[PDB]
Amino acid sequence: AGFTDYKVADITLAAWGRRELIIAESEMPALMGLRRKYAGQQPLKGAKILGCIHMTIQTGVLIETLVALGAEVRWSSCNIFSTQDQAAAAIAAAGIPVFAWKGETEEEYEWCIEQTILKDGQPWDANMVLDDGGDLTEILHKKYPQMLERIHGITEETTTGVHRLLDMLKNGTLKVPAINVNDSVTKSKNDNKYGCRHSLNDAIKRGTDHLLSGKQALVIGYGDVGKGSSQSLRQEGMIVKVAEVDPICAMQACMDGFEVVSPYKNGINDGTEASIDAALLGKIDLIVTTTGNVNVCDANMLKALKKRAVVCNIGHFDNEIDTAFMRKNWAWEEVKPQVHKIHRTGKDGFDAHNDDYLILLAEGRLVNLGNATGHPSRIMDGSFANQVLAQIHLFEQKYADLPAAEKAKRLSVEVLPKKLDEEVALEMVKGFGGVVTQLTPKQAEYIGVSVEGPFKPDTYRY
Amino acid sequence: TPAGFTDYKVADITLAAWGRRELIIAESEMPALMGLRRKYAGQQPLKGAKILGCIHMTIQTGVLIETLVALGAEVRWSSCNIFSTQDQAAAAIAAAGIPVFAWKGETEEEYEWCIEQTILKDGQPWDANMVLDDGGDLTEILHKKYPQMLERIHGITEETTTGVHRLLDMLKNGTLKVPAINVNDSVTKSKNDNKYGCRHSLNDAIKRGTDHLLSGKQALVIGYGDVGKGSSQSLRQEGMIVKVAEVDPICAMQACMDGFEVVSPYKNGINDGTEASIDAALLGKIDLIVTTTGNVNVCDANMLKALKKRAVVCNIGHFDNEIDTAFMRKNWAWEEVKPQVHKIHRTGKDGFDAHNDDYLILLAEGRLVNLGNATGHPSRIMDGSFANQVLAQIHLFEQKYADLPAAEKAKRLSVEVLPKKLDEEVALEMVKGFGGVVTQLTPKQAEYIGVSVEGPFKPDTYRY
Amino acid sequence: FTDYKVADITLAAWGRRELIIAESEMPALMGLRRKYAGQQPLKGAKILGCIHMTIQTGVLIETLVALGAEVRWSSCNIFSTQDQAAAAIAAAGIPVFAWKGETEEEYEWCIEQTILKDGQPWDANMVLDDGGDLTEILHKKYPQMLERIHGITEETTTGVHRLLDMLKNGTLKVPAINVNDSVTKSKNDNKYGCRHSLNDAIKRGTDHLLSGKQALVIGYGDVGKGSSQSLRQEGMIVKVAEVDPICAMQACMDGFEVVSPYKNGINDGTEASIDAALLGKIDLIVTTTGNVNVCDANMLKALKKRAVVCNIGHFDNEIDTAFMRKNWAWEEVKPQVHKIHRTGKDGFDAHNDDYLILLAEGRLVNLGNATGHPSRIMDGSFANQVLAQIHLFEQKYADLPAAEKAKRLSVEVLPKKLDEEVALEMVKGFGGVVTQLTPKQAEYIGVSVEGPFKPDTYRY
Amino acid sequence: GFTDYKVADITLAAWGRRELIIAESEMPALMGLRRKYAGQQPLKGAKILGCIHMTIQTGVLIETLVALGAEVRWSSCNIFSTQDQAAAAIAAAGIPVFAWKGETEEEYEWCIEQTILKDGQPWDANMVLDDGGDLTEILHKKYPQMLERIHGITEETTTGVHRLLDMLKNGTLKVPAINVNDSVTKSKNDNKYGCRHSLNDAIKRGTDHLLSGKQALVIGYGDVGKGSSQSLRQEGMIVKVAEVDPICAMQACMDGFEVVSPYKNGINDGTEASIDAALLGKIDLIVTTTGNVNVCDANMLKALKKRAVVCNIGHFDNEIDTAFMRKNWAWEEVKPQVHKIHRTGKDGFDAHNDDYLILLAEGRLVNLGNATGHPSRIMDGSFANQVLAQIHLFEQKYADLPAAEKAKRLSVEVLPKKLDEEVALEMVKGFGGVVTQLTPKQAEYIGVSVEGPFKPDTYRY
Ligand SMILES: NC(=O)c1ccc[n+]([C@@H]2O[C@H](COP(=O)([O-])OP(=O)(O)OC[C@H]3O[C@@H](n4cnc5c(N)ncnc54)[C@H](O)[C@@H]3O)[C@@H](O)[C@H]2O)c1
Ligand SMILES: NC(=O)c1ccc[n+]([C@@H]2O[C@H](COP(=O)([O-])OP(=O)(O)OC[C@H]3O[C@@H](n4cnc5c(N)ncnc54)[C@H](O)[C@@H]3O)[C@@H](O)[C@H]2O)c1
Ligand SMILES: NC(=O)c1ccc[n+]([C@@H]2O[C@H](COP(=O)([O-])OP(=O)(O)OC[C@H]3O[C@@H](n4cnc5c(N)ncnc54)[C@H](O)[C@@H]3O)[C@@H](O)[C@H]2O)c1
Ligand SMILES: NC(=O)c1ccc[n+]([C@@H]2O[C@H](COP(=O)([O-])OP(=O)(O)OC[C@H]3O[C@@H](n4cnc5c(N)ncnc54)[C@H](O)[C@@H]3O)[C@@H](O)[C@H]2O)c1
Ligand SMILES: Nc1ncnc2[nH]cnc12
Ligand SMILES: Nc1ncnc2[nH]cnc12
Ligand SMILES: [K+]
Ligand SMILES: [K+]
Ligand SMILES: [K+]
Ligand SMILES: [K+]
């Protein structure tokens, strides 16, 4: 009532979004348990959170949990294609500043982040940052250092964002402490792996409706995302080959029943077309990049791929595939939103019945969020419970209020304690109806733990 | 071969030629280990090493032993389990002139005597300077009974999760006398051996012991660590309906996401010591229970009383006390079907009806079932574990802890893992053994993610 | 051209882009275009067609037209049409009456618009049907039209059942081909199609995580087999119900627990017969039977709160949706997704926790909440359809003397050689290479190098 | 003083009996028939020549036939498939059996002849139970006068049924037969799921090789090839499938396998040049499943990757050209039923030669040769069908019919679907499964009886 501090595609989608938020709450017991547990305490009272993460229904439940615990927020998405417009509308209609829609331009994307940072033309009195991929963190460090003086911490969602934070810490340019939310086991080995297992074949089916059974896939990478991606395709009946630079990850792919191959002859990427295994790439129906690295599906790979193969990326940033090369040299035909045929016959025009094209999904951006709805609520429950606990921890530590000598001792990138990781996990297990056994005192003594946990040393890999 | 060689004890030396044939095949399945042989034989990095070894005397252990010898070591060997030896492996090693005391089906008394035969030579302590152990039993006997021998020993290389736990307790209590390398927690060990090895060998052992169809039947796996993960997959891939018990909610979360129902033998997960706390409806539907925990009494007497008639009971953790077999020895009549397979008749202690329908089938008398009823992990998986073992032996032997002044000894008394670079190099050889091709980063790519082109590729915190 | 009714003709360009992609996914059907285009075997055919107006059906329609036929087309389900496909067909000058979200009355009107042209019965002479509704309307309401029709080609298990009942009763008036029971139809479509498209539809409709949750699949025929796999491969804990013990044996061997919603399997009509403990743990129930009331009112009352309920059999009476309409309040989440509030009939609390989620109002969920089977699977079914249309049209039953008709009035299948030829084109679409027997090897196993490679009794 | 047998070691009998008692608890359909029919003695007067793998599972079948009143004389249908403790237990029960693991081909023939003859003269046989058709062939070729008094043959396996249908076509089949193979509770239980259980079992027992991550080629994708492909894929192998039947190949593709041919463009012209050497050089394991001849031929064997494993799970050992390997290459026995074949030549071998293949069971049925064949709970279905087929043909009394009526009954038939379903129901109850009962309204709706049969005879499952 009088609220205009937002920008979304269509505010009238709010009732639809609210219906889906009410369903999603029933799928997110760890997050909803934190609401119940901390509602009276209001641990985020006085927190003012700049948030930059995919404006989905799941992020909706995260936002309203932070608000229910006392926080004020200003929100944007961390990707131009990942917003669910009904989710953004429901948040805006609740009176929460959100600047996000599906299908932003790069200029609009940056404008949206700037609308969270500034309120009424001046820096908002922010004191906390929640980020997915590091874009908001980078803009604050480069353009708003005075704001960081009053910010107590950053809670960072994803592998790429943490790598950026560690580079800043190494270079002495990180200005506030961070929690690496990614490396909770209830994030990394739930979201990154099982979330992509669910949502990769989901996005491919929505975008192309292609049969996957019996066809040949190449997954570039076998980290947490590459593992879940390979399972997403293999469980559909795809014949999956895996590429890797890490021999330990490659070993896992072999033992998991995949053939390990390289796009390059003997794995040597010397920049020549001669180095491409053309016989291999000419048999591939689907390539998926999962690395967080640059140019792992390069121009010469794209030139050699089988006619009508599907090309997509589920890493955080669109530079895993050389889409710039495709924009410069080949003609793009939109099939429908986030689905383009790339005609390898030339740049100027195309024949509508040309057989020599590739299908690119989400213009090379995160395909699970761009062509579907990303991870399901019950998986995001784990990631976002960690986010709320991380926000509580850094806000209560009050880094910005500490003397300089004390700041120096606390300026770090840390993970949440294992005990909290376990508490998130138990809520997830209860949501499945699972029943965990309680150790007897003698059994706890025998393996050297407290009955209530933690149950594993910090070195344990799960 | 050595003339007059008698410094061994095995079941049947005539199996040696068969053992040797299998060692030659196994060498072709163990490229990381054989690559170490080829790379280091001329350097002789273990020349002067005198290694006491205690680990399952299988064909795979034979390839490890002869790798250490080829690098210059002398060894004296025993098995770390009474049922895990392959007698043809023991025979081939003995026939090669290597002291080995090991056979399938030892008594507990014979088991201890075999370890002591490695420790002693001609009635007196051998001048050992290295220890290679699997489960901690040899480590324990040396500290307990021959503490003076530890004054000349440079290190212990410990293979398995249970043994590392014992070393860490000793370290924290000030009772560990020499430094050790935790071989178990190399990724090419723990996440290869413990998981994939059990995937291969659990269903193998159940089939050899019982020849039961597994598809369509109900299993309960106690534990979902690395062994529990691999065990659950061994059964699920055969078509079993697998339920998983855990005390660790993170491991339980993984089981749910992996497609398993998580359940407890106890109502509400609480064991109050009474029969009434047992979920009798659940246990009365289970055809197979497998313990994987490294913990004590996780398949207890009340659970055994509640199990469905003719269910199979087995343990793939390191020690037999996961299952309360002592209760079953005390109260129920054992009928041997064949070696390492017993029907346990719940009708009473004194005799049994040959056609009684109320029995359980116990495999390997509750000892490690993959080694007891089959041959344990396959060579190509043990390649990773045993390559790490050789590298750990070389590292500790070259460090020469026993020759350091006591000040430097306090600074080095630790339980360490091998560096990730070595872990990666073992993995690369394994991948090449499958014919896999690892891609090489470009310089720009390596800069982009902040690694060297040669690795390591992951920070030490990475969990894979 | 105005002889059509679709949701939005401006979607035609989009539909045409998707048809061009689908053609590249349907090698058996496009091979039939290439090999029969010269002969024009359907020249003079006037085909009434009633099947889901999807992109895949568009490629089928345009194949029939490419071989010489005229058609008039409708969907066989109110929710299965892809509006861009109908638009592209209408824009091509082909009469089609079909949109996503028809009412039952509009559904019947659409079939009647294919039957009538300019207020009079079209001079149709062939029938292509999926489910038997068009076949039924012709026999009951326009029986004189059947005197000019040479044959019916029926797509699905339910429709074949209806054809056989009519043949047994002496009420079938023209010969038919059972397309369903080509192996490249039944053992491709019914099973593998549902494997692809069931989890697809559930994700699109709910975006629920399936891994770790409990499913109950009612039925384990071809659709139940593919459905059970669609869920188990996502990591669901799947239980299977069956009345057929052979199918139940397969479910056990395939690694599923076989259960009944009723104590000891006995459905005696009472709430007391419901296994309430079982149903109270189920997160998802899927019906696959082609039978009536296999997810009944007492089961729906006993289901776990917030369970998803859906049907992938042909007709919406597998679930007792009428009971839910009568007794419980429906809250639309979005098209083809309803929360059914078990708290009562008149109104609901927006935050009530005691609801079920029904997909597609109990209608075919893969077509209702997603896009049905994928092109490369529908390729097998629709190549068989084309071959069956060619066969019956060239036979010209409607022109035979009465004595020759009596010996021709049957429900037949296509010869195994054609089944094998469809399969060969599908295998080449995957890049697979089929080996050729040597003469000695063919002699050894008692077949021709040319095939057929199996007796008609072989079950694959 | 019972001496009418020949087994490896009669002192194994107590061990065999312990395993039979366990197996009975795993075979509820077969033991159900025992309890149902023991009082009626439907096989009283039956005198059955039996030729099928002398396993523990066959022991339960034999003792079911005897419990129902039959007398039998038994041999194995494969030289490597007998479980010697099973044979001993049967012989110690006073049942004539001539079978041991590791027969020569001459011993194999002699064992069949010992069942046919008693005291040097034809036994008064009147029923035949066969697996593969060898006993059937010897009777037609050498003992036609015995067939005049035989009421029928119950044949277990695909290859034997083919041999029966050839005789029927040629007019040389002398007695009617039941095709036991094509019950659904046989073909789509035993042939498929039995090989799923027992193929990777035999490979592990023979080689202890890791299978995960390695490349397999399965020749054939019928019932045995389907189960064999699953046996390997579920272990983590990368499995490729070859087929001559495009419908079976379509199934392999849709089931998630790559379909390949050993021959370039699938053309087997007999030349080395036709071999896809790149493909064969990547294969770690080849398994033949076809019932055909020479599907793993000499040129494939020459092209295979060094140290690949070669085995056959079809009925006969000519699927692999082992004759070529005997003639050209040196064989080194690793242990019983496991040989290294050294491709370096015929005259001896280097013990450390790297260029060898590993052949299992000398190319004979690998699941029975290197392990124990299918498990009891699967053989329960096949062998309940066998008992029911024996009862049916014995009660028909074909040998006693007039010539004109014999001509009308000389056929190869399957059991009716109601029997198939009742066998399946007992199997499902053995898993604890609960089948639902149709209401009258539902039965009318789909047009079946509440008790079944639930499917038309054309249904393929
Ligand atoms: N789309 C999603 O929902 C989602 C979810 C989580 C993470 N992510 C993103 O996905 C990316 C990967 O994350 P992760 O957690 O799997 O990281 P990870 O470190 O666990 O895995 C990345 C893998 O890529 C491999 N790799 C790097 N360069 C390669 C090359 N040239 N060829 C082949 N393999 C190569 C590395 O060896 C590594 O194993 C990051 O950008 C992360 O932020 C996306
Ligand atoms: N047989 C083999 O070849 C083999 C191979 C490797 C390791 N092991 C042995 O197996 C055991 C387990 O090894 P690991 O590497 O899997 O260890 P791990 O710590 O990774 O897993 C053990 C799991 O057991 C769970 N657990 C403990 N007590 C429990 C209880 N009461 N109920 C249910 N779950 C319980 C723990 O939470 C833990 O996740 C050790 O004894 C190890 O030495 C055996
Ligand atoms: N949605 C799709 O894309 C699609 C595709 C093909 C077929 N169908 C339809 O799906 C239905 C099934 O087709 P099908 O080919 O699998 O038929 P089918 O005969 O192969 O299988 C139906 C199964 O349901 C079982 N069944 C019947 N009543 C039952 C009950 N009360 N409880 C449990 N099981 C019961 C039968 O025993 C049988 O095995 C038909 O209506 C068919 O037209 C839908
Ligand atoms: N070992 C066992 O326990 C066991 C069990 C059952 C049957 N069998 C035997 O296995 C064999 C196969 O039985 P089945 O029931 O699977 O028969 P089947 O007819 O179902 O399958 C055999 C398949 O082999 C294919 N084939 C034939 N020649 C081929 C070639 N040159 N290349 C590739 N594929 C080729 C055929 O197309 C067919 O699909 C028979 O000999 C049978 O008696 C063995
Ligand atoms: N085969 C094997 N040899 C030695 N140690 C083992 N641990 C597990 N399997 C083993
Ligand atoms: N165990 C077994 N017994 C008899 N015949 C068989 N055929 C396959 N496995 C068998
Ligand atoms: K989602
Ligand atoms: K082994
Ligand atoms: K579709
Ligand atoms: K067996």
Side-chain angles (χ1 to χ4, degrees), chain A residues 240-416:
Chain A
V240 181
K241 292 172 181 51
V242 172
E244 253 288 356
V245 300
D246 185 320
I248 297 176
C249 293
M251 178 278 289
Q252 297 177 292
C254 295
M255 293 289 177
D256 292 343
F258 300 104
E259 184 177 350
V260 169
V261 304
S262 179
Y264 313 98
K265 300 175 182 184
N266 311 125
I268 303 304
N269 181 0
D270 70 1
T272 59
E273 291 204 79
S275 70
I276 298 292
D277 189 340
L280 172 72
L281 294 187
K283 297 191 329 160
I284 294 296
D285 299 297
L286 168 66
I287 179 164
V288 185
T289 59
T290 72
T291 65
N293 206 340
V294 58
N295 210 23
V296 305
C297 179
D298 68 16
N300 290 330
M301 289 172 60
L302 291 163
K303 295 158 75 175
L305 268 172
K306 190 180 173 175
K307 287 181 183 181
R308 306 182 289 280
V310 175
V311 179
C312 64
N313 167 48
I314 193 162
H316 186 81
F317 280 130
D318 64 286
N319 60 344
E320 301 215 19
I321 305 165
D322 193 350
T323 65
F325 166 85
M326 296 198 292
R327 293 186 186 282
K328 215 290 291 268
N329 293 273
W330 292 336
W332 294 39
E333 169 185 26
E334 184 174 316
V335 179
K336 69 186 181 175
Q338 285 75 61
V339 180
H340 293 83
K341 291 161 70 198
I342 318 294
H343 293 266
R344 300 190 292 193
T345 40
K347 155 106 155 192
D348 292 342
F350 59 93
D351 187 304
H353 295 100
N354 170 43
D355 68 338
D356 184 7
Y357 60 85
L358 303 175
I359 296 181
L360 175 66
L361 299 181
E363 301 188 42
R365 275 81 175 164
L366 285 170
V367 64
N368 60 328
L369 289 149
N371 287 89
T373 68
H375 299 349
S377 301
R378 194 168 293 275
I379 279 174
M380 292 313 298
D381 191 36
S383 311
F384 286 168
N386 281 282
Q387 276 288 2
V388 174
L389 293 165
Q391 282 283 316
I392 290 167
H393 178 70
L394 286 177
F395 179 68
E396 291 180 347
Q397 169 181 80
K398 291 295 194 289
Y399 173 94
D401 296 342
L402 300 170
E406 295 305 317
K407 282 200 229 285
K409 291 145 85 159
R410 317 261 249 277
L411 181 55
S412 65
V413 181
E414 307 286 337
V415 295
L416 292 182

Side-chain angles (χ1 to χ4, degrees), chain D residues 52-58 77 81 83 131 156 186 190 194-195 198 365 367-368 372-376 379 382-383:
Chain D
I52 177 166
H53 315 291
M54 185 60 255
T55 60
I56 286 295
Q57 294 68 46
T58 290
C77 65
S81 62
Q83 293 184 277
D131 186 332
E156 179 82 358
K186 201 288 179 170
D190 171 319
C195 293
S198 61
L365 296 151
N367 59 328
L368 286 149
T372 68
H374 300 348
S376 299
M379 295 307 300
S382 313
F383 285 170

Side-chain angles (χ1 to χ4, degrees), chain D residues 24-88:
Chain D
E24 289 159 17
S25 77
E26 291 282 302
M27 304 178 89
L30 190 55
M31 297 297 289
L33 291 174
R34 248 194 233 188
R35 287 179 284 270
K36 178 198 205 87
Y37 279 108
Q40 175 190 137
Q41 292 292 285
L43 290 177
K44 170 171 287 167
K47 303 203 170 195
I48 308 170
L49 297 165
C51 183
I52 177 166
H53 315 291
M54 185 60 255
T55 60
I56 286 295
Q57 294 68 46
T58 290
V60 186
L61 163 67
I62 288 169
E63 293 195 316
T64 299
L65 297 167
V66 166
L68 300 196
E71 299 179 3
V72 308
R73 297 179 68 79
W74 219 264
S75 70
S76 189
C77 65
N78 189 271
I79 55 173
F80 293 142
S81 62
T82 295
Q83 293 184 277
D84 289 332
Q85 71 277 22

